[model samples]
Target chain A: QIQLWQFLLELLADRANAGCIAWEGGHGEFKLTDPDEVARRWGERKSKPNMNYDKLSRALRYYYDKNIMSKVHGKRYAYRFDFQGLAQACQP
Target chain B: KGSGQIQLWQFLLELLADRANAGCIAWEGGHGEFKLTDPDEVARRWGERKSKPNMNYDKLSRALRYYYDKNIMSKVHGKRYAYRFDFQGLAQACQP
Candidate 1:
């Protein structure tokens, strides 16, 4: 029952996925280096085979209204994760 | 069954896409194909999540084989420990 928000954070925390996605370690910023790869992966996960950067970005944008995530002002494919709105990664 | 299976499929996709889990498993070659780098670890984790302490790769693999009957997964003929997901069918199910 994990949401995309938590899943994104887990991606950041995992070092193996550094090439496709990584953290800036400041301002809660993160970068999506391979959007298509990520989108395809996400699409497979969500059972949304047609998912692309556009659709995935749209979903991410929807999170902005809830303050769950925000885009970096000038970085391409850059964004921030709001921990306050997320369930802590590991509770138990 | 659909709900439960979808969750597991989603979990597998996330694992394949993430580099961090490369030590344990990864995408094999192309579309929806994946290989378990460390079958034991995967089985261990799946066991934990499913509350089956005795679970092993043999049992876990058996579970995966069951998906074949549903057209959800299939083994690559020459690739040991490799399986492909039926992404197209999965996506259609997710839609309204």
Candidate 2:
């Protein structure tokens, strides 16, 4: 989804060059900008129904590390990642 | 000032303040998100204020385009349909 990609880019990499989504649960309410409809829509995109707050977040977090993403402080599920910079940053 | 120009100016001012106020808007509150009410409602209001019952976004925008020639506005690159409104400070400041 272009909207999802746009949302992520605008959040993480765009802010201090650090950005990632967190799996905060409870009505899928974490970010102030996210709405219930948007949440349900994104979950449906991934074929997940019971997708509450945590698991959806876990999947998002799984992309971290291994040249995928990095964890941000105080935020367990959120990540700091740059698709373009991953390779360059990962190279030893 | 032409009625249309005045309306456009007012709209741009609100737009400017809304964008600059983005910093003040918080991620924890509902203010941070970009928001828009019914587009038709906005069009109706704009038309009413301008006393142009037949006015529409396309026509309003077309009427506003002359500002570019006057150096008051310029289209933003890579963000087609988006524009940059020029200000007094822009002239005296270095372009960098």
Candidate 3:
């Protein structure tokens, strides 16, 4: 039932996932140390056996239009949470 | 190229990107998850890749367990030999 962006924020708040993915800046900026890792975990959580990052990234690509998430061009696998989406992601 | 420059996760992906290589590994891809299709074979290859004279499944798994110690990984409780890179699933509900 959880969303990708929300699940990402779930990881963003956890130190356990920092080795592969973590928040880059204190202000909603984050980098996927191994975006592949996120894609894998995302697949398992949803009970979906074929969820690769290519489609997953494009899923986020859709978010770019919604202004929920934005890609950071400075690095590969880098993204930032938008102000509007931030509250939803950071919410309890 | 130096193998030391590559981490275990990256190396796995290298094979995963080419999962067809001897069918050594495969993906499940929810939040960076995968499984060793042939653990013993991968350990052998990993041994050769690491240029190590002695590498076996136990030792290789020991190294993978270290990631758990580092809290960067979590063994999938729902399945066998399944370890996750720490994260969630598809954006099916929250989609556009």
Candidate 4:
């Protein structure tokens, strides 16, 4: 029953995922360096092998209403989870 | 025969999602590693869910071992009852 954001947070928590999706220089901002690639990965988790960037972003767009995440203007593939303040790489 | 077919990994995540389950099992790492704080209790719950009245840590742990090659979980060495969700494969990115 893991939500998409939960999976994203897990990815953010690990420094190894920096290459694909990473926290940008700005506060709470994250960039998807590899959107299409991440889409495939997300699909695998959902048993949705055919997922694509469009469908993936569509889900992220839906997040805008829930306030879980929002797109960053003027930044390519950037978004923010403003409420999860001081997001840091973790131990527990 | 009425028991559901939810996988162990799925069930473990379900329990981990709840704060009340902390006494039995809880998150131990940012990367999805979790510990069976009360291995007996955790297994008991699993048993109940699966309708396997004889379930215990030995059986529960044995089932978890099967997920090793499946890339959904991996046993953490030197940590009793500690296992990490194997999301390493998801981190790798490729051109679409």
Candidate 2 segments whose C-alpha is farther than 4 A from its true place:
A1-92, B1-5, B18-42, B89-96
lDDT to native, each model: 0.66, 0.40, 0.64, 0.69
Docking class of 1: incorrect
| Worst 10-residue lDDT window, candidate 1 chain B | B1-10
Complex DockQ per candidate: 0.09, 0.02, 0.05, 0.09
Number of the predicted model whose TM-score against the real structure is largest: 1
Give the per-residue lDDT of model 1 (tens digit) for B4-90.
222345456545544577788766565557788998998897777678899899988888877687566788998678887774444
- Return the TM-score for each candidate structure: 0.55, 0.32, 0.45, 0.51
Poorest 10 consecutive residues by lDDT, candidate 3 chain A: A83-92
Fraction of native Cα contacts reproduced by each candidate: 0.00, 0.00, 0.02, 0.10
Report residue B50 deviation for candidate 2 (angstroms): 1.1
Task: Tell me the lDDT of model 4 at A73.
Answer: 90
- Winner by TM-score between candidate 4 and candidate 3: 4
Q: What lDDT would candidate 1 get against the real structure?
A: 0.66
Provide the DockQ value for model 4.
0.09
Give the TM-score, chain B only, in order for the candidates: 0.82, 0.52, 0.72, 0.84
TM-score of chain A of 3: 0.85
Off by over 4 Å in 3: A85-92, B1-96
Task: Looking only at chain A, give the TM-score of model 1 against the true structure.
Answer: 0.84
